[PDB]
Amino acid sequence: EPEWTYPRLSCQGSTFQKALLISPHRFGEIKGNSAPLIIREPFVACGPKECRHFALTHYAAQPGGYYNGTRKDRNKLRHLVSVKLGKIPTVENSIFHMAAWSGSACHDGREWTYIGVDGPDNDALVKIKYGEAYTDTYHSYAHNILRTQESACNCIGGDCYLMITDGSASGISKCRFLKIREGRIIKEILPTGRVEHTEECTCGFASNKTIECACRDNSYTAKRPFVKLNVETDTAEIRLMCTKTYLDTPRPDDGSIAGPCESNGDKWLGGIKGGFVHQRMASKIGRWYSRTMSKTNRMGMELYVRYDGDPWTDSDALTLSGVMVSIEEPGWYSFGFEIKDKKCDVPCIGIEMVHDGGKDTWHSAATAIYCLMGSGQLLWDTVTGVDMAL
Amino acid sequence: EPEWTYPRLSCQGSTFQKALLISPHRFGEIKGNSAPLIIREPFVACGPKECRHFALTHYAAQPGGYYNGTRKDRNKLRHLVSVKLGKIPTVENSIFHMAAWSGSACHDGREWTYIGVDGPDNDALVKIKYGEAYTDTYHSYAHNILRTQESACNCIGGDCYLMITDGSASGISKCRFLKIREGRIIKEILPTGRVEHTEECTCGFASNKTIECACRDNSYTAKRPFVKLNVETDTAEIRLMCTKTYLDTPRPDDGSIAGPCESNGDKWLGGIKGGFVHQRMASKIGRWYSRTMSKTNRMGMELYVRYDGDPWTDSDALTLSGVMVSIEEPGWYSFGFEIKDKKCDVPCIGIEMVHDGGKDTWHSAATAIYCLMGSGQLLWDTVTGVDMAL
Amino acid sequence: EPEWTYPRLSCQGSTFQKALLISPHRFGEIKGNSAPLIIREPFVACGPKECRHFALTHYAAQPGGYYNGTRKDRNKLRHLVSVKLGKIPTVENSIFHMAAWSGSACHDGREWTYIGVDGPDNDALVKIKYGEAYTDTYHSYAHNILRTQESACNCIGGDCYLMITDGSASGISKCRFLKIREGRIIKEILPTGRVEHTEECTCGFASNKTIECACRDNSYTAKRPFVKLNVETDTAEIRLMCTKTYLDTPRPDDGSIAGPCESNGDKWLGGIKGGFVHQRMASKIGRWYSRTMSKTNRMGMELYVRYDGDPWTDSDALTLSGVMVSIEEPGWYSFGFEIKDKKCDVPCIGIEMVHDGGKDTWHSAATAIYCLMGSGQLLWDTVTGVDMAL
Amino acid sequence: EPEWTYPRLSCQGSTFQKALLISPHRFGEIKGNSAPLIIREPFVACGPKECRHFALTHYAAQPGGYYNGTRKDRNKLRHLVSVKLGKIPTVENSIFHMAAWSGSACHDGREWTYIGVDGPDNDALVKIKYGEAYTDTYHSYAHNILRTQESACNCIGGDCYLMITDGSASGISKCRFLKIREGRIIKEILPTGRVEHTEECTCGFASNKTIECACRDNSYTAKRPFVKLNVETDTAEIRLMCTKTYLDTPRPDDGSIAGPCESNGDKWLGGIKGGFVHQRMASKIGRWYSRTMSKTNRMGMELYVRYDGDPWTDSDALTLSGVMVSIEEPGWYSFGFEIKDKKCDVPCIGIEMVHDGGKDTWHSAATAIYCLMGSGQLLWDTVTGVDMAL
Numbered sequence A, B, C, D: 001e002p003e004w005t006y007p008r009l010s011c012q013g014s015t016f017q018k019a020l021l022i023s024p025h026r027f028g029e030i031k032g033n034s035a036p037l038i039i040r041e042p043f044v045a046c047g048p049k050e051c052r053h054f055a056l057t058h059y060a061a062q063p064g065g066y067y068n069g070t071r072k073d074r075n076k077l078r079h080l081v082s083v084k085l086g087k088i089p090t091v092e093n094s095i096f097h098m099a100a101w102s103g104s105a106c107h108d109g110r111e112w113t114y115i116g117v118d119g120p121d122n123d124a125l126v127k128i129k130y131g132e133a134y135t136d137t138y139h140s141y142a143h144n145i146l147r148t149q150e151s152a153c154n155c156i157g158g159d160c161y162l163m164i165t166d167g168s169a170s171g172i173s174k175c176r177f178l179k180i181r182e183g184r185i186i187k188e189i190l191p192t193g194r195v196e197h198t199e200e201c202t203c204g205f206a207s208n209k210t211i212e213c214a215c216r217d218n219s220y221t222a223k224r225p226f227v228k229l230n231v232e233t234d235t236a237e238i239r240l241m242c243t244k245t246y247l248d249t250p251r252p253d254d255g256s257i258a259g260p261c262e263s264n265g266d267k268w269l270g271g272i273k274g275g276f277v278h279q280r281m282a283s284k285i286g287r288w289y290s291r292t293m294s295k296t297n298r299m300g301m302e303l304y305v306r307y308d309g310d311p312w313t314d315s316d317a318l319t320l321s322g323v324m325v326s327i328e329e330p331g332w333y334s335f336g337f338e339i340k341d342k343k344c345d346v347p348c349i350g351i352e353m354v355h356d357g358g359k360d361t362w363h364s365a366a367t368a369i370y371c372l373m374g375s376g377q378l379l380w381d382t383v384t385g386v387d388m389a390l
């Protein structure tokens, strides 16, 4: 009878450092003998004794003969696979959990909960799996590509919270939050505040009663919608991040969005999932965010930190913490997760490093990990090492 | 000292949805580096903490050099292999349990029981394996290809029941039922009623005292012989399904078989294993059946449901529940199994999707899973995604 | 604190049947993607909860580029590998225990004991490994290729007994028996009686106090030296098998060796490891032996049984029990082992099926298993299914 | 709640013998189907119930297409991988622990501690990982390629000690020792005595209170700096080995370094990690050392023993114990580790056998193991068996 998991104080530290790189395609050469899966939207989720590396595979390998459509996101073949953190995700190594083109997963400290989203675009569906059993589902409410976090959900006392969203990519996409337990939705929280477009939320626990989410707005602003979920009263409001250090992509010069906090600025059509994680201290609270180096393209990734304050109203720029990836390497989706050590949690930030070589070749990604270890300053950057011509 | 397993109330729900697809041959391209096994007659069987994906391999892989005879069913090389549900069944991933060209497996909630059938056609033999030890056997009684369920058997309080059959494909094939425990046959139940031809029985627990089986009659009717096994008195009778929604293949227009329930109608030489599973409710009982879309060919697969009643005498047609596979994709053997969640059972229906490209190429199959999750209606269908030319 | 293992009453039965075939080279085609190891002298050994398939690999795979010398037996590369029974022994699947060109392994019911033999021909050495630690060794006493059983050893109350032998192939090879415990030799038993040549002993427990061994004499007779080890007084004597059903290879017409039991007959230079296992009944004792069909070549394998009596003085011929392999298939080393079920032991006989295609190609073997299941008569035979040209 | 580990009395014995060879590249032929990793600096570290084989992979396989730079030591792709001792370290078989081009690992008898070193040359960084969590770090103090042991660290009562060093290859490289516990540095020990250059220390427990290290001096002498760490007072001093049997490479004729113990002799620019391990007896203490056969090149490896005495002042030559590898085979890094058996420790010495074929081909290594088993004298040598042209 294990015990439910709760967020604890982070482990002693003051900087992030390169920890691990998973470059499956370093072994997919034509002259090689490996079958690394072609995937995208990878993230990490950790339980009390193990961390797992989830991803959305196109049910194809490299080398392989199904490179066509691997650039697309939604299709009937896509599946949510996963391997223990550290193993190369190969055909034989990974385990397929369910058909899905959008997903997330979390551990309530007793069992794994898998969330997948598939079905027709105008009527997609969320599927909750608790261990080996398919336990529940949620239907599309705005009837426009029901999608999910694309990163770990968050459990507490057996209660797991997950953002979902239905809505147009260029229009309105009011998100929701499902309170899950043992695999069955026990309540849906409808957020208030600026809710015209949230999605690909990167949620984490700021405290035992509050969950914050650095999310993505694809149509109205380069600013990041910020969710503050009160687990206590099970209510959630959203407001834009006030910092001049815009975390979306594309974005304009930092601080170039005149007006007050709520100001959307130019549309800057598009966005991207951003990494974000909490560092809980006895009396302080550090918020770590990721964001591509290029402000127009998904290249490079720099770390930013900001202790205490109110993301909703603080115009102050974030403190550049270092470069995790250079503008010469790809820097796509960024996510957050916390490794659980003896008596403290280790906040981490993973970076999807897509190997994009067009739409006439394979389309996959490597995963770079950076965690909070000791003091000093970020020392090294990460490269995939992959040549797409092999 | 684990506890014996018993069938419990299904989990809350009212519809089936695509859950998982296992397409091993998505990685068997000539330019790939995987060794997926060439198999057929796959099914699933779940224990208290894990589900396994069994199949009958021709002891060959793709790409490979032993594609000849993989279309045949019986030979001295065939073996009953199995992998945990979710893993791709490769040479290295699967485990060979015993030489067999016909089989089944169930978990008494304490240990796995494997059943295999091999030997000469006119004197085949059933082999029971309880874990690692070969525990017993049953001989051919009608001396004509002793065959078995081709899907999970069913245990209760340590008592596992399994249909077997000896008999001509075009003639009489009176089936039997073996009461097994700890691997040794403790009694054989001889069914009564219409018993001229039953086989490839798809059995499940309608209740703690009754096991029902939607079976196959290859020579006399497109209707499905229906077995009702009383675990209590250990007796079994068979009678045809009265519904106008004929579940075999080939079959004639629905409802075109005039006469009373027992009416065999035209022979319609041939048949196929059909999926069928129970959804036990406190006061209701839902019976789910599968059947190909085409009435003459093994293409497509639609779901049908019918709550309560007596399959033996209800002429009413089944309620179409949705399309699991389209007539453009292959739809062969269908089976039933129940995933065991915390306090309830999740009824599922798997579909064998054979990649038939003739008898001068490899002959294998993918497995599609659909389970009972939440309400609404079946949203998406399943495709193998496999190109046999690769 | 597990409990030491002891031999128990066999499980109910009266015949042997094909159980499992491990044909690793069914997946070693040039066009395949598997790396099955090239091995020889395979055997099986079972612990309370698992059976393992050991072999001596030439540290090479098929397809591979080190086929040269794989026909040879002794070299510095050879290793004792092993996989769980049922898995194909591939490069990635197996585990290398120690450098050895001769070996054996047994489970005292608490931990695995591995025995390997390597070193220079004129001064080989036996190495005992208890789990992960290298625990002891035994030196060559006759200074002529110290070799070992080539099959499972036998433990009882933590005491494991293993035959070893030093001596010329064409001359004298007086064998010995090491009493091992927790990996360290605690006594060496020197057999009496006809001891001019014993080797490749296939030992098993006839009872809780007696171990019998059907062994091999390569230079003096087609008859099989028979060892009777009294675990009680830790003494052992050897005498030839008196039956006219000569079990060695090559051999002359059955019963053609005139004279009394002890009569060696013609030399018939050569021999082979023979399968042999006990079936202990409350008041009866069945001895199962294997032997090639051809009396001059290692092709085919037939089963022979003989209940009660004294192998040392019974001239009566063995009762042919059936054909496990036909003269069209190779039939090399045969061994015995007992699977441990709930409360009884299942006697089995495995058959090495070497794929010999000369000395200018790869040289490996498949393993066929036949166990004691139910009554009736052996129904089917075993074929490797392997084409060496692929 | 496992118990902390402590060094115990070695197991009964008086000689070393070939135990195991791991030649991953025996399966990397162009015509093969395996993906063995390209690695270097391999070592072994054992916990109470398992031994693991660590190495530093260049994140590439053979056959593969990234052979360039595999000769180099430091780069952003390098990772500390590991597999259970006995398994071939393949892409799929191994587990990546962290990005690192220098490392070590030990088991406190409760959990694994991994140490990795990466970052910029002039500001490298040591990373401690305790299980799945990144727990701490140490910065470069001499700002010149912070490097580490390259072999197992040593725990006692939960306290793990590890040598690190910062400094020029041709100049000064004063080393340090980190006292770790549960993954966090709790104290740094600064050695005294001759400390102008120590590194690649091969440490082991001479007793429950003393740790000795046979290290490497790359610029001042062919003699081996010897560290004696008192776990009790947590202090460490270093002095050169006085024996005429110089263990470094290159070295001059044995005993050719005139003067007293402390005499450095000629520079003999360069060095190599040397194997060294303790054999603790109730009243005696055997020190085992390894060293290449050639005194100028890294070929061959012979074993040397010396019981009792003071390495710091004993001019007596070591007792040649045997040849583990011949001058025809490569003999690079040598390391020590102790397998833990029931109630005693088994001292072992592993040998890295690099397959160097230039800088225009792949650059990897095999691992040879030799342990203390029984009496007699080392009987056999070890060969890789690998042809680099395949």
Ligand SMILES: CCC(CC)C(=O)Nc1cc(C(=O)O)ccc1NC(C)=O
Residues within 6 Å of the ligand: A073, A074, A101, A102, A145, A146, A147, A167, A168, A169, A218, A271, A272
């Ligand atoms: C452009 C598609 C749109 C969906 C409304 C969206 O913003 N979601 C979305 C975007 C990306 C990406 O920009 O890389 C990847 C996956 C997505 N997830 C899915 C489910 O497509």
Ligand SMILES: CCC(CC)C(=O)Nc1cc(C(=O)O)ccc1NC(C)=O
Residues within 6 Å of the ligand: B073, B074, B101, B102, B145, B146, B147, B167, B168, B169, B218, B271, B272
């Ligand atoms: C046509 C063979 C006949 C056997 C009497 C039969 O109906 N059994 C049978 C049929 C199929 C199929 O129709 O696909 C597959 C396997 C079978 N199982 C076996 C054991 O062949």
Ligand SMILES: CCC(CC)C(=O)Nc1cc(C(=O)O)ccc1NC(C)=O
Residues within 6 Å of the ligand: C073, C074, C101, C102, C145, C146, C147, C167, C168, C169, C218, C271, C272
């Ligand atoms: C012909 C070699 C001789 C050794 C004295 C022997 O009888 N042992 C021996 C024989 C065979 C075989 O006949 O197939 C295989 C392995 C053997 N084992 C070894 C260790 O070679």
Ligand SMILES: CCC(CC)C(=O)Nc1cc(C(=O)O)ccc1NC(C)=O
Residues within 6 Å of the ligand: D073, D074, D101, D102, D145, D146, D147, D167, D168, D169, D218, D271, D272
């Ligand atoms: C020549 C490089 C120098 C580093 C100051 C050194 O002596 N370290 C060092 C040497 C070798 C070798 O000689 O084979 C291998 C790895 C090393 N480790 C690293 C970290 O390079």
Ligand SMILES: [Ca+2]
Residues within 6 Å of the ligand: A092, A093, B092, C092, D092
């Ligand atoms: Ca594999």
Ligand SMILES: [Ca+2]
Residues within 6 Å of the ligand: A216, A217, A218, A219, A220, A221, A222, A223, A248, A249, A250, A267, A268, A269, A270, A271, A272
């Ligand atoms: Ca945006």
Ligand SMILES: [Ca+2]
Residues within 6 Å of the ligand: A092, B092, B093, C092, D092
């Ligand atoms: Ca494999």
Ligand SMILES: [Ca+2]
Residues within 6 Å of the ligand: B216, B217, B218, B219, B220, B221, B222, B223, B248, B249, B250, B267, B268, B269, B270, B271, B272
């Ligand atoms: Ca029919």
Ligand SMILES: [Ca+2]
Residues within 6 Å of the ligand: A092, B092, C092, C093, D092
């Ligand atoms: Ca593999």
Ligand SMILES: [Ca+2]
Residues within 6 Å of the ligand: C216, C217, C218, C219, C220, C221, C222, C223, C248, C249, C250, C267, C268, C269, C270, C271, C272
């Ligand atoms: Ca003979």
Ligand SMILES: [Ca+2]
Residues within 6 Å of the ligand: A092, B092, C092, D092, D093
């Ligand atoms: Ca693999």
Ligand SMILES: [Ca+2]
Residues within 6 Å of the ligand: D216, D217, D218, D219, D220, D221, D222, D223, D248, D249, D250, D267, D268, D269, D270, D271, D272
């Ligand atoms: Ca030196």
